[PDB]
Design a binder for this molecule. Structure first.
Ligand SMILES: O=P(O)(O)O[C@H]1[C@H](OP(=O)(O)O)[C@@H](OP(=O)(O)O)[C@H](OP(=O)(O)O)[C@@H](OP(=O)(O)O)[C@H]1OP(=O)(O)O
Length: 251
């Protein structure tokens, strides 16, 4: 019954008066939060995630297409302001890292072909447009492209056959070409092995084997990895993967 074409427009007062007060450590990054699909679950996740760290984050409802724009918090915290799609305010242009999270649905099962119903080629092409735009504002040293959505990584396949591995090979030269202070060893793709969601406070939870949804701290105690990093190692020119949070787990 999910309507992926609902396309609820961002309510600025919802963020300022409800979500920021409810949900809001200097991160060294600008966080671009890109809502790819028009369902209300994606919309709420985008709002909630932004509202937890509103000063360094940007919302883009990419599902709005020609009407997509950057939304972000004013310097004084009293307003949600706007710029053209993927642009950022002056105060964020000196950050040395970019985190770009694509909010999407994965599938009921692991898959290697699509994220948010987008092929590697399709998402790569959008990332190319994104990179050509953010270079007008920022020249970081580090980039993470974070795929927030279920079942997009498995250690049972070669990293190069997985969607994040394929995506990294597809985009890495565009990243280093456009963002000249980013080298290959400073690009990572974030991906999930398990189902994930953003809770009503803007925190990521993972669906454990028990059927319980668990937060960051509980996942670590449970020895369950909520996010993998996929990266390219120039030393042997191979794609690799490792767990972000679980010291032992790697490709
Ligand atoms: O800084 P990142 O590498 O992008 O990771 C952040 C970071 O987690 P850790 O530094 O503990 O690994 C945030 O923690 P803080 O900076 O706020 O201390 C946490 O947000 P929470 O405070 O809510 O735990 C967030 O998690 P979330 O996805 O819930 O925004 C998580 O990002 P990742 O989940 O993508 O690793």
């Amino acid at each position: 019954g999910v309507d992926f074409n609902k396309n609820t427009a961002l309510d600025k007062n919802y963020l300022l008066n409800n979500k920021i007060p409810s949900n809001n450590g200097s991160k060294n990054y600008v966080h671009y939060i890109i809502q790819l699909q028009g369902d209300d679950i994606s919309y709420e996740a985008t709002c909630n995630l932004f509202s937890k760290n509103p000063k360094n984050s940007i919302i883009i409802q990419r599902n709005m297409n020609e009407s997509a724009k950057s939304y972000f918090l004013s310097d004084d915290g009293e307003s949600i302001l706007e710029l053209n799609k993927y642009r950022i305010p002056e105060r964020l242009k000196n950050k040395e890292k970019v985190k770009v999270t694509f909010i999407g649905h994965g599938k009921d099962e692991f898959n290697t072909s699509e994220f948010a119903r987008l092929s590697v080629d399709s998402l790569s092409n959008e990332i190319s447009s994104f990179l050509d735009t953010i270079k007008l504002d920022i020249s970081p040293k580090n980039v993470e492209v974070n795929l927030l959505g279920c079942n997009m990584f498995s250690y049972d396949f070669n990293v190069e056959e997985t969607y994040p591995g394929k995506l990294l090979l597809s985009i890495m030269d565009k990243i280093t070409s456009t963002l000249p202070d980013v080298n290959k060893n400073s690009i990572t793709i974030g991906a999930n092995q398990y189902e994930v969601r953003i809770n009503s406070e803007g925190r990521k939870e993972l669906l454990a084997h028990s059927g319980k949804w668990i937060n960051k701290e509980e996942a670590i105690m449970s020895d369950l990895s909520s996010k993998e990093y996929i990266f390219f190692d120039s030393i042997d020119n191979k794609l690799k993967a490792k767990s972000k949070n679980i010291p032992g787990l790697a490709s």
